[PDB]
Structure 1
Amino acid sequence: YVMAIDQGTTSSRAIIFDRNGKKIGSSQKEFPQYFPKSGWVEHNANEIWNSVQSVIAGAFIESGIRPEAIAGIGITNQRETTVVWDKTTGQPIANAIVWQSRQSSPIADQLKVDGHTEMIHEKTGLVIDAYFSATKVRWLLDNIEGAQEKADNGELLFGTIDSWLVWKLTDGQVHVTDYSNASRTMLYNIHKLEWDQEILDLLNIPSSMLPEVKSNSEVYGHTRSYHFYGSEVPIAGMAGDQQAALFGQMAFEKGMIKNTYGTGAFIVMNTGEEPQLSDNDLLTTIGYGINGKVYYALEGSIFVAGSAIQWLRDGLRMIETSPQSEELAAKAKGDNEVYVVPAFTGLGAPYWDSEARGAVFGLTRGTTKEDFVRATLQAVAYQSKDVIDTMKKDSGIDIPLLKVDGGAAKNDLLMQFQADILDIDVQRAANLETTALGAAYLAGLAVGFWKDLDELKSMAEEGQMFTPEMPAEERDNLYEGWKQAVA
């Protein structure tokens, strides 16, 4: 079978996808997110492992076949979260920073300033955007537990979620990572995919606790046991949610583009083997195509998206449930200038805002009780529009009927109020969570389970496009709001 497991940020979803693109489980658990002072959000490794176990072994709902035929494992874990654990005492005495809280601003700003600030960006593409894993580490391993000297002798070996789940999965393993997530961690690099020492040696310790990385289909078993081969069933995938979605959605050819609006609005393309970067405030990333090999591509720079939606329900309830967007909200015309950019800690986009926390905007009396709700629906799609519109202006590659998916993306209406200004169609792949399948496939590419990428092509469904509407000759009229009331 295929154990297409997902993780989002904590939202443990996905199950044992029964080979032929089918389902047999209802794994959906969103653990209680915490919001400390200001925006110092960070869920302890405890919450990570406790939830992961529920999906891993828990995925056995209907198709509970023993290790004798499961396989096809492809962990679609989260990404950028740098967790730690104490090897000597054997018990983790700390928390885990999250990729959605710019709690790094306190310190990172005093070190950049001079030339080296742009140094990384003007050449690579990425930029030290505070919450970028490595940068966050410069604070973590200091205030929490006084033992600087101990940090020299390993002590609390650091590593991303990948290096975490694997390490303490069953017990015994090596600090592994993967290319896809690697670049994001900033310790590695897109134009390197290897362990860049030199600069990194500035994180209090000279790269002492260096995580390992994996290249292609890391189809591998474990170190659990106790003199017996147990909880040592095969595996792969081991990649970030958004990264798995990238190649998973049949993206194995030129010009293949997608979209996945959920906790984050990440769009990735397929530029063959060209590590390029869009000088217009855009980042860099990797991709896949043709045969089982790593390609290169660009992405969209977003901090968060579906956070605004998860926010009100756990505060300004009102409507109780978030899916209301599909129901009592449709005939409500549209947002109407209230562009509430999901700014919990910083904004994101080409503008970043390393100090701006919170962004109400849309100062209009319309903001009554049930008003705030639809604001996010509109905003998220438009947030995608921000990078989309600017992208064509440089690359020149026009975007066709792109593929879209995601838990939050389930709102049919979201597709309509998005493609509008772009004047084109979109097609949602016949699969609510196609993301899980991507990383999952990377297990069969070893034991001769899967021949090669060229096979799935014959089975697809693209008859899910929305009919273009006549009313639109003005579109950018709203667009102007992006160039107003925000700075």
Structure 2
Amino acid sequence: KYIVALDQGTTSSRAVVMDHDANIISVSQREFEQIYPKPGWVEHDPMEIWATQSSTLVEVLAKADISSDQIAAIGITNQRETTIVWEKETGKPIYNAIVWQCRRTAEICEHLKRDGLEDYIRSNTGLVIDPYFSGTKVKWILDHVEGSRERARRGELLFGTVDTWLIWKMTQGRVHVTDYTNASRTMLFNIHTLDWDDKMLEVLDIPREMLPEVRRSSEVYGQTNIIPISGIAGDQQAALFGQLCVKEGMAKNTYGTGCFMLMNTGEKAVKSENGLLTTIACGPTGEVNYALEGAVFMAGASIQWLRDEMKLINDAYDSEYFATKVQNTNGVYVVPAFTGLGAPYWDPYARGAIFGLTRGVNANHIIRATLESIAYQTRDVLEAMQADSGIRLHALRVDGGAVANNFLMQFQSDILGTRVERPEVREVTALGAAYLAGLAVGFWQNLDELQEKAVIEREFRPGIETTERNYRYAGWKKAVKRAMAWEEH
């Protein structure tokens, strides 16, 4: 007997099989194509998410020699914000999925601002006016398709998120539900009331007809044919959970496609005053908890950029190696605002920029710089976190893909002047979803059954270079300020 998790990431879709002992049994990963229709735009093919996920699943079961018979439940984690619309009858997108990064609905926000919903929006969504979240994405979609809104009021049109969509594709159309975590990300949902905001739904001309049903992050939502799908949570929040976020003051940082720092606020929705989002997470049984989140659009992807377009490296892994060949960036800085600046800057107009080049800067300075950007940004978000919450971290718990980079890790540590703790299992995001599902199935009963699979693999302590950290950051700050507001409107 085991649980199964689905992690449908920005970069790729995954599938994990764990035993009762919470052991990672087998995994299935399968990258999928990112598409760039225009400049600040990012999209994905709904059917490809779909496809890649389904497949990943099988392939795993198969890999381990497991039968539907032996799987207790199914957990689901996905990328946030990223929006989808689909014909009810057909099971067909009326357009590609707009990505969380996707800067297209920028102007719309410009209205929203112009109107004065800033205060409102913050206050009830806990969010911030930004093309990052779901509202505008939906609106833009209907505003760009002829038979749309109408087709939707009559209710031929479904709205959703990777979870909403991943679910309905498996429960043959039976189930149209999202979880609490997910929904908070959308801009259309009220965090205090724990429900759809009407004033939002109005303002942005969205018709309730499309919104799915919203539910606990643990609950059997339904059954499928690999059976019961018992857990759903936004990736970031799942990782929070799997790190055993779960208690007030607890925090993690995730280094994946982007970067997300979350801190559990129990039952108190703390108002951010430093460019952080206020949002939903789980309490120890999947219950609504609140949280502070710092979102950074680009981290592991920069690496992928050096990897796939710029072509400097053959593997992300190789970045540790080249970056180390150099000691210093040689004065170079890399503001990876390839899709704007998120927290705490929130400038959907900043665009990438490299700075401080001279004749003898080379490849390696640049790679290293790209790595370093990752730490700077974390630091940026960190400070906000501390201010907002009034609590000072003594260590940083982390997880994610990039966390394998001793260089980055260490460098993180120094530039932070804080211990960095690296969990023994990188796949934490997944674990969350499992837990969320097995708890919900009595597969586990209690989180405490588990206070042990969170063995720490390694501690990163500040080195004497930690002394330079303020010097280095300053430039970073200086760089940033010049990447901002590139694009016009």
TM-score relative to the length of structure 1: 0.91
2:316 paired residue number: 322
Between 110-119 and 8-17, the greater mean CA deviation after superposition: 110-119
In the other structure, the counterpart of 2:269 is: 275
The answer for the alignment partner of 1:118 in structure 2 is 119
The 8 Å contact of residues 73 and 441 in structure 1, kept in 2 or not, is answered as no
* Equivalent residue, structure 2, for 1:18: 19
Deviates more, 1:405-414 or 1:16-25: 16-25
The secondary structure found in structure 1 opposite 2:70 is coil
Deviations for 1:59-98, whole angstroms, at most 9, x for unmatched residues?
Answer: 2144222122212421112221111111244543421111
Which residue of 2 is the match for residue 338 of structure 1? 332
Does 2:215 match 1:214?
Answer: yes
Structure number with the higher helix fraction is 2
For 2:397, the equivalent position in structure 1 comes to 403
- Residue equivalent to 1:311: 305
Residue 390 and residue 150 in structure 1: after superposition, are their counterparts in 2 closer, same or farther (change >3 A)? closer
CA 1:221–1:208 in structure 2 vs 1: closer, same or farther (change >3 Å)? closer
**What are the ranges of 5 or more consecutive residues in structure 1 without an aligned counterpart?**
225-230
- AA at the equivalent of 1:158: F
**In structure 2, which of residues 250, 255, 263 is the aligned counterpart of residue 261 of structure 1?**
255
Count of residue pairs the alignment pairs up: 480
Judged with a 3 Å threshold, the aligned counterparts in structure 2 of structure 1 residues 90 and 463 are, in CA distance, closer, same or farther, namely closer
Contact 2:139-2:206 within 8 A present in 1 as well:
no
CA contact (8 A) 1:424 1:468 kept: yes
Q: 1:368 to 1:83 in 2, by over 3 A?
A: same
Alpha carbons of 1:314 and 1:293: their partners in 2 closer, same or farther (altered >3 Å)? same
- The answer for the alignment partner of 1:83 in structure 2 is 84
Instruction: Give the structure 2 partner of residue 354 of structure 1.
Output: 348
CA contact (8 A) 2:8 2:162 kept: no
Contact 1:72/1:235 (<8 A) preserved: yes
Partner of 2:97: 96
Taking structure 2 as the reference length, the TM-score comes to 0.91
The 8 Å contact of residues 108 and 136 in structure 2, kept in 1 or not, is answered as: no
CA contact (8 A) 1:425 1:465 kept: yes
Alignment gaps of 5+ in structure 2: 485-489
The answer as to 2:198 corresponding to 1:204 is no
- Aligned 8 A contact 1:3 1:15 in 2: yes
CA contact (8 A) 1:319 1:370 kept: no
SS in 1 for 2:413: helix
Aligned to 2:168: 167
Tell me the equivalent position of 1:132: 133
Q: 1:259 offset after TM fit, Å?
A: 1.2
The answer to whether the 8 Å contact 1:101/1:344 transfers is: no
User: Kindly tell me: are residues 89 and 409 of structure 1, through their superposed partners in 2, closer, same or farther at Cα, counting changes over 3 Å?
Assistant: same
Tell me, yes or no, if structure 1 residue 30 matches structure 2 residue 31: yes
Give the SS at the match of 1:436.
helix
Which has more strand, going by share of residues?
Answer: 2
Matched, 1:426 2:420: yes
Work out whether residues 6 and 15 of structure 2, in 8 Å CA contact, stay in contact via their aligned partners in 1.
yes
SS in 2 for 1:57: helix
Counterpart of 2:443? Answer: 449
Closer, same or farther in 2 for the Cα pair 1:331/1:372, shift >3 Å?
Answer: closer
Amino acid at match of 1:470: I
Which residue number in structure 1 is paired with residue 430 of structure 2? 436
Shift in CA distance, 193/56, structure 1 to aligned 2, threshold 3 Å:
farther
1:368 maps onto 2:362 in alignment: yes
Deviation >6 Å, runs of 4+: none
* Secondary structure, counterpart of 2:287 in structure 1: strand
Aligned residues: CA RMSD? 2.3
CA, structure 1 residues 315+290, in 2 after alignment: closer, same or farther (shift >3 Å)? closer
Deviates more, 1:364-373 or 1:302-311: 364-373
**Are the counterparts in 2 of residues 428 and 465 from structure 1 also a CA contact under 8 Å?**
yes
- In the TM superposition, 1:216-295 aligns within 5 A as 216-222=217-223, 231=225, 233-295=227-289
Identity of aligned residues (%): 57
Q: Quick one: distance in 1 between partners of 2:247 and 2:206?
A: 42
Q: Could you tell me how far apart the structure 2 residues matched to 1:110 and 1:360 are?
A: 31
